[PDB]
Antibody, heavy 222, light 219 residues
Framework: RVQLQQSGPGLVKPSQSLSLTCTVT?????????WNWIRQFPGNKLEWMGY???????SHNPSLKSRISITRDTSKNQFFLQLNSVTTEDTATYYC????????????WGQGTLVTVSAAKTTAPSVYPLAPVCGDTTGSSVTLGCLVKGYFPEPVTLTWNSGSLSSGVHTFPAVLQSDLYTLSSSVTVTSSTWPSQSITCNVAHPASSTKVDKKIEPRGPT | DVVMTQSPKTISVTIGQPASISCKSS???????????LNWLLQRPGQSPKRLIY???KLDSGVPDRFTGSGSGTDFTLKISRVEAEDLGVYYC?????????FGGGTKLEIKRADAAPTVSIFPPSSEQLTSGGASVVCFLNNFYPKDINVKWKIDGSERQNGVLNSWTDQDSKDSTYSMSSTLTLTKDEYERHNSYTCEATHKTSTSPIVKSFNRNEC
């Protein structure tokens, strides 16, 4: 029905501003809804930031005291968030979300966009293949992996065989240390299938415009 | 501002059994036109929050009728008549009656299942990484239940507690298990100086650790 999609820069320097866009499809922004911005911090903490409604009337949380502007462009069917004077405490996942003005119904949220407030430098990841030890390849299943190391900011995307290999996958939350992230992913397949059916981890890091497609080669002759 | 207090913080429920969650508001949520702007939402792992209940007691659009919202005034309840594994995640309440609008702190629903030992796999540093001066040893502890687990690393048979970083997945609704990754990072020179690397998983499923090892420079 109505669909919302956030866009905007994912890395902001302290004391500058965050600027996000919500593009609404399937519904006119000049009808029926309140168009909200909501952000999520660690520990399941959600904060309502404000809305602009279908008539262009706005409201925002006093917690954001004068730092926030919510606007719209009806010719583009978009509404916007500007949050100035950011600090690291503004690092969060930002969502747009429409709720009906009349009753709070039909809540529809975007996918969310992570905004990191940091002075640290954008860094492309190194993508390393994790090939099983010989001793662990003689059973019915075999587990392979990929290590995505040394990148900043989040996120990356990781798939296996371009998304065609999706079952048996565990992609773990990244760990941050010294302003760099590391993430790993495992994939488990039937052992007799490998290495006859190749397995490749596809990593993308939009912030550095980098993609890596790493084929997992067996240890031992290749 | 209105405080929204949810309880319990977490619940663990077997598939097919009921669940009930409470949300209590610091101020009445009834409005001057007889509406109560109290919503319930579910946030599944890696997703945005999604609608469940609105107007205190009404099923929101497209939501399965297994969910029921009840209450009035300051005290509200969400019931799930029979839990399904895809129900796992964090339930929130939200109020829209008093500015500024506020959310409860969330209640995490876990699916209770039979215990399952982890599948443990260890991985040496890639040749690619070794050309760079660092060396990461990775161990995966996959598809276990319940969620608590311990990992111990050893180098040449001696415990190594320095340079280990762990990461845990959310519960999987496909099988209601958990997974964990543990990464031991060393310099390349320190890695190339030792021979055997071991990761040991200790899980309630057995008093015996699951041990996986390799020797550097052996396949």
């Amino acid at each position: 029905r109505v669909q919302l999609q956030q866009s905007g820069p994912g890395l902001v320097k302290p004391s500058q501003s965050l600027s996000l866009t919500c593009t609404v499809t399937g519904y006119s922004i000049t009808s029926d809804f309140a168009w909200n911005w909501i952000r999520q911090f660690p520990g399941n903490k959600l904060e309502w930031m404000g809305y602009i409604n279908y008539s262009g009337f706005t409201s925002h949380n006093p917690s954001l005291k004068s730092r926030i502007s919510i606007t719209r462009d009806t010719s583009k069917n978009q509404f916007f968030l500007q949050l100035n004077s950011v600090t690291t405490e503004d690092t969060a996942t930002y969502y747009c979300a429409g709720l009906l003005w009349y009753d709070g119904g039909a809540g529809s949220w975007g996918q969310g966009t992570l905004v990191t407030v940091s002075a640290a430098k954008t860094t492309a990841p190194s993508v390393y293949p994790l090939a099983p030890v010989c001793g662990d390849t003689t059973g019915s299943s075999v587990t392979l992996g990929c290590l995505v190391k040394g990148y900043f900011p989040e996120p990356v995307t990781l798939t296996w065989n371009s998304g065609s290999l999706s079952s048996g996958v565990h992609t773990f939350p990244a760990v941050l240390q010294s302003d760099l992230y590391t993430l790993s992913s495992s994939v488990t397949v039937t052992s007799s299938t490998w290495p006859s059916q190749s397995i490749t981890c596809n990593v993308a890091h939009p912030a550095s415009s980098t993609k890596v497609d790493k084929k997992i080669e067996p240890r031992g002759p290749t | 501002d209105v405080v929204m207090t949810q309880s319990p913080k977490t619940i663990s429920v077997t598939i097919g059994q009921p669940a009930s969650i409470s949300c209590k508001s610091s101020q009445r949520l009834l409005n001057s036109n007889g509406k109560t702007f109290l919503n319930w939402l579910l946030q599944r792992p890696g997703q945005s929050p999604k609608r469940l209940i609105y107007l205190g007691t009404k099923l929101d659009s497209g939501v399965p009728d297994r969910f029921t919202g009840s209450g009035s005034g300051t005290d509200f309840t969400l019931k799930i008549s029979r839990v399904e594994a895809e129900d796992l995640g964090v339930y929130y309440c939200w109020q829209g009656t008093h500015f500024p609008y506020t959310f409860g702190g969330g209640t995490k629903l876990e699916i209770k299942r039979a215990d399952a030992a982890p599948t443990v796999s260890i991985f040496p540093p890639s040749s690619e990484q070794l050309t760079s001066g660092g060396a990461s040893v990775v161990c995966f502890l996959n598809n276990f239940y319940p969620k608590d687990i311990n990992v111990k690393w050893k180098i040449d048979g001696s415990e190594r507690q320095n340079g280990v970083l762990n990461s845990w997945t959310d519960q999987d609704s496909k099988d209601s298990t958990y997974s964990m990754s543990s990464t031991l990072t060393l310099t390349k020179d320190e890695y190339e100086r030792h021979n055997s690397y071991t990761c040991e998983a200790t899980h309630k499923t057995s008093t015996s650790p699951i041990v996986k090892s390799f020797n550097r420079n052996e396949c």
